[PDB]
Write a protein that binds this ligand. Structure first.
Ligand code: RYD
Length: 131
């Protein structure tokens, strides 16, 4: 059979403001993302990536369809973000990732994980799109 492995990295970077912010108490800017391990345009084969934030955010289900696959926000809190990757072939099961937003230990805060999206015997059309 055919196995196509698409390596990815996901997670977040964060920047401390320098001071807590009086008007909302946010302390950090952060960006949560998915990106390919090697430079490729994932929109060849990815329909959309959903980023589900803590429900205390407005419009906590954030959707990106065009790279880069990232969401930039501010806040004070750390919580899991559910990252769901949907494919152009609706018969390819979506990939669900789970990421704990990291804001704390000058140096940019980074928490980034490697993973692999495995396509076992895709349609010939989806094969072309993955290669
Ligand atoms: C959980 N958390 N952390 N920081 C937050 C900021 C907002 C929007 O002001 C909502 C929820 C937040």
């Amino acid at each position: 059979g055919v196995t196509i492995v698409k390596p990815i990295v996901y997670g977040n970077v964060a920047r401390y403001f320098g001071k807590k912010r009086e008007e909302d108490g946010h302390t950090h800017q952060w960006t949560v993302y998915v990106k390919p391990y090697r430079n490729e345009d994932m929109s060849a084969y990815v329909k959309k990536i959903q980023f589900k934030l803590h429900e205390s955010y407005g419009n906590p289900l954030r959707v990106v369809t065009k790279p880069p696959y990232e969401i930039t926000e501010t806040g004070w809190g750390e919580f899991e973000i559910i990252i769901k990757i949907f494919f152009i072939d609706p018969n390819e099961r979506p990939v669900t990732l789970y990421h704990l937003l990291k804001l704390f230990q000058k140096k940019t805060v980074v928490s980034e994980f490697y993973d692999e999206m495995i396509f076992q015997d895709p349609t010939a059309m989806m094969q072309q799109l993955l290669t």
